[PDB]
C-alpha cells in the first residue's frame, strides 16, 4: 500500500506542477489510507473515487 501511495503521490506532484505551469488550479492532493483514489486499495484504504478528478 505505502509503496503504491508513494508512486501515485509522485504522479500527483507532477500533475500539480504541470497544472501550475499551465495557469490552471493545482487541486490534486496526496493519498493516504484515509483518502485514497486507487480502486484496488478500497477496504484497506478509504476509496474516494473522485478525490483527484
Q: Which residues bind its own copies (CB under 8 A)?
A: 25-27, 39-40, 42, 47, 49
Block residue for cell numbers 497544472: 19
φ, ψ for residue 45, nearest 5 deg: -115, 165
Residue 48 CB, shortest distance to Zn ion, in Å, is 10
Was 45 annotated as part of a binding site?
Answer: yes
The DSSP code sequence of 18-49 is HHHHTTS-------BTTBB--GGGBTTB-B-T
Nearer to its own copies, 33 or 49 (CB): 49
Of 14-53, binders to Zn ion (CB under 5 A) are: 36, 38, 41, 45
Amino acid at each position: 500500500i505505502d509503496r503504491e501511495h508513494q508512486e501515485r503521490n509522485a504522479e500527483i506532484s507532477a500533475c500539480n506542477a504541470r497544472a501550475l505551469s499551465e495557469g490552471r488550479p493545482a487541486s490534486l492532493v496526496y493519498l493516504s489510507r484515509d483518502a485514497c483514489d486507487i480502486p484496488e486499495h478500497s477496504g484497506r484504504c478509504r476509496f474516494v473515487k473522485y478525490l483527484n478528478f
